[PDB]
Design a binder for this molecule. Structure first.
Ligand SMILES: *[C@@H]1O[C@H](CO)[C@@H](O[C@@H]2O[C@H](CO)[C@@H](O)[C@H](O)[C@H]2NC(C)=O)[C@H](O)[C@H]1NC(C)=O
Lengths: 49, 50
């Protein structure tokens, strides 16, 4: 997604990104949510099993 | 027990120590360590094998 890369399971989420923020973050600086640059819908990321 | 706090100091101390150790282990993944970048994907896909 737009430069930042990774792997995992994508899911729909209900976060409240500010109108200029791109991707969320966690306590330990591990990417958690993203905003896909085609429909501006927040999207959640889960680690594999 | 009900009103006053800080009686259960020892168990809370144990939990805090474990959490801090784990957090500082995880946090050590963003250090450069003398390489050119912290992340391995870009450095693997941007230069020659040598
Ligand atoms: C980029 O292009 C896409 C597709 O061309 C646009 O997607 C539209 O999204 C809205 C709601 O998100 C839909 O109601 C439209 O039907 C979509 N258009 C099409 C053609 O399917 C999108 O708006 C464009 N702009 C951005 C910033 O993503």
């Amino acid at each position: 997604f737009n430069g930042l890369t990774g792997t995992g399971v994508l899911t729909e989420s209900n976060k409240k990104f500010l109108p200029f923020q791109q991707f969320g973050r966690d306590i330990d600086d591990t990417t958690d949510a993203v905003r896909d640059p085609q429909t501006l819908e927040i999207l959640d990321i889960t680690p594999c099993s | 027990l009900s009103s006053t706090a800080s009686a259960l100091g020892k168990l809370q101390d144990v939990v805090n120590q474990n959490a801090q150790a784990l957090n500082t282990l995880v946090k050590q993944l963003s250090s450069n360590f003398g390489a050119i970048s912290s992340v391995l994907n870009d450095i693997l896909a941007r230069l020659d094998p040598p």
